[PDB]
């Protein structure tokens, strides 16, 4: 028996390579790893905490553009929407 | 791109063929057309590959071990074998067989005569190969010579692609055992390509394809053709491709 982290499960329809069985492949995989990105102003979602809560840390903080990975304008709109939400009861 | 080599006294050959063994038409069929066709096929196969740069013999040696790309091997084998055959044929570029060659023959075949050896070769040609093929008199790392038949594009050089007997038909027990031994030897090689060492050299190639004889000799009389070829061949060339 062995743990899941040290054995790459090649998918069903995929191609593989001799290298793909190796430790080095697994390491490489480990190294290399939404509605707001889709193209709709986040300021529609200010009555939708469920969706806005995805762009928020466990405590309640808004996530940084480095983390969330948004367009700057779109990020600022999202932030605005979140702030509106918490001004209201909902969220 | 692989193109056919210019033979000596080419115009004369075109006019006549070869004095005894092949007609003007029959020589054209075997060489001036068939060889060209083969070369074209080889070029088509190996146009953009790394094989384009290499000579036919070197291509064959590269390819021999690979099961896929057997077509390339076949073509390369044919091209080389056919030009060897033509070289053997050619009148000039009278010559007798060498003394050394005769001594080697004597050593090999239990002290028999050259005529006897020829007769044994023609018998082998008659019996062994059905359809197409080649008839070589080869020399190996043990200085003695021996007769080697191949069934279409089998090379005399590399023993796993000798193509020496047909398993399409039924085979003997001894033949099977020999095959098994060869396979074992191949497995023992232990390389990534998996290619054995072999130092077999052809001394007298003969072309048992229908591209040589069928025009002149008809569908039968292949044996007769072979005999004629043996009688009248370039001996100087043979002598040259004999000594170490």
């Amino acid at each position: 028996k062995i743990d899941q982290s040290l054995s790459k499960k090649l998918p069903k329809g995929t191609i593989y390579d001799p290298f793909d069985f190796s430790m080095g492949r697994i390491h490489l995989d480990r190294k290399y790893q939404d509605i707001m990105k889709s193209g709709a102003n986040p300021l529609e979602f200010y009555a939708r905490p469920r969706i806005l809560s995805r762009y928020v840390t466990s405590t309640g903080r808004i996530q940084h553009r480095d983390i969330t990975g948004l367009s700057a304008k779109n990020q600022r709109r999202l932030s605005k929407a979140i702030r509106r939400c918490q001004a209201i009861g909902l969220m | 791109i692989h193109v056919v080599p210019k033979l000596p006294n080419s115009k004369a050959l075109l006019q006549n063929g070869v004095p005894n063994i092949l007609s003007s038409s029959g020589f054209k069929t075997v060489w001036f057309d068939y060889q060209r066709y083969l070369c074209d096929k080889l070029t088509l196969a190996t146009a953009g590959q790394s094989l384009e740069s290499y000579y036919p013999f070197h291509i064959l040696l590269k390819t021999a071990g690979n099961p896929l790309q057997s077509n390339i091997f076949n073509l390369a084998s044919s091209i080389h074998n056919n030009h060897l055959f033509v070289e053997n044929i050619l009148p000039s570029a009278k010559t007798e067989p060498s003394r050394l060659f005769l001594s080697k023959i004597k050593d090999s075949f239990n002290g028999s005569d050259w005529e006897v050896v020829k007769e044994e070769m023609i018998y082998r040609a008659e019996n062994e190969v059905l359809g197409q093929g080649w008839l070589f008199l080869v020399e190996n790392n043990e200085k003695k010579l021996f007769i080697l038949t191949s069934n279409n594009n089998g090379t005399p050089y590399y023993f796993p692609r000798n193509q020496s007997f047909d398993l399409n038909s039924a085979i003997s027990i001894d033949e099977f055992a020999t095959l098994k031994q060869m396979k074992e030897l191949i497995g023992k090689s232990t390389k990534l390509n998996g290619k054995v060492q072999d130092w077999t050299m052809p001394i007298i190639c003969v072309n048992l394809w229908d591209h040589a004889y069928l025009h002149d000799y008809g569908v039968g009389n292949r044996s007769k053709y072979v005999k004629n070829v043996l009688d009248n061949l370039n001996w100087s060339v043979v002598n040259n491709r004999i000594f170490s």
């Binding site: - | 791109i1 692989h2 193109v3 384009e52 036919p56 056919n82 050593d107 130092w199």
Partner: protein, 266 residues
């Protein structure tokens, strides 16, 4: 030939050496047999059989890969006139221009060889050495593959002080008489510096212009063309394109050397 070959007994098989010899003999006579292979590029053939400046075409230059300039983002705009267009995120060097500059360069190489000048082939990149040495051999010339110690011409007496100088005929015979210690210590400056990577040895170019020596260089799409006397626009990164240009230059210089020898004989 092969005086130490111990041949095996007639009853015994071939020895290893004897077998090798037999293989060699086969290779010489009947291996290259079945066909002949026209229209194909052998790398070595550009060094040992380069074409004359006349017979070079745009097509040959393109095949060599001379047209492939550095990159769109690594552009020295000083080189703008030489470049044809951009494609595959790479500036492509106008090759008619390249040809004309090469011819001009080739002619000057020939001229200095004819006059009996010291031609120096400078090529610091990895693969360039062998071809550079061949070129240097071809004209009775010189080369540098291992790095150019800054100040070989400007500070010649310190650097190139303890190496042997020679005397030479109107032909190229050593005429071995003793050079005086005053006669030896003078600098021996090249009459043509020809570089294969001017961007990598700026320094060499700078003393050449200080030391008052005309210079030839393979100017890529990132190199400053004003830094030497006779720039050849082209692909300095690929090894084969450089060799092709270099080999051509060597051939041009070789011709001029031959002409000089002929006129000496006359």
């Amino acid at each position: 030939p092969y005086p130490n070959l111990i041949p095996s007994a007639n009853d015994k098989p071939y020895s290893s050496q004897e077998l090798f010899l037999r293989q060699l003999n086969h290779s010489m006579r009947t291996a290259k047999l079945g066909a002949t292979i026209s229209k194909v590029y052998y790398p070595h053939k550009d060094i040992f059989y380069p074409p004359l400046p006349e017979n070079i075409t745009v097509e040959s230059l393109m095949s060599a890969g001379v047209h492939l300039g550095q990159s769109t983002s690594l552009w020295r705009s000083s080189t703008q006139s030489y470049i044809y267009g951009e494609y595959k995120g790479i500036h492509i060097i106008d090759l008619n221009q390249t040809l004309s500059y090469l011819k001009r360069a080739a002619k000057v190489v020939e001229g200095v060889s004819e006059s009996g000048g010291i031609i120096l082939f400078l090529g610091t990149r990895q693969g360039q050495k062998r071809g550079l040495e061949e070129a240097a051999k071809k004209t009775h010339g010189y080369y540098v593959s291992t790095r150019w110690i800054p100040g070989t011409l400007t500070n010649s007496t310190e650097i190139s002080g303890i190496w042997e100088k020679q005397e030479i005929d109107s032909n190229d015979n050593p005429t071995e008489r003793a050079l005086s210690p005053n006669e030896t210590s003078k600098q021996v400056k090249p009459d043509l510096l020809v570089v294969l990577n001017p961007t990598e040895n700026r320094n060499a170019l700078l003393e050449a212009i200080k030391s008052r020596v005309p210079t030839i260089a393979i100017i890529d799409t990132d190199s400053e063309p004003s830094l030497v006397t006779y720039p050849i626009p082209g692909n300095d990164d690929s090894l084969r394109s450089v060799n092709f240009l270099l080999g051509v230059l060597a051939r041009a210089g070789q011709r001029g050397l031959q002409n000089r020898l002929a006129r000496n004989n006359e």
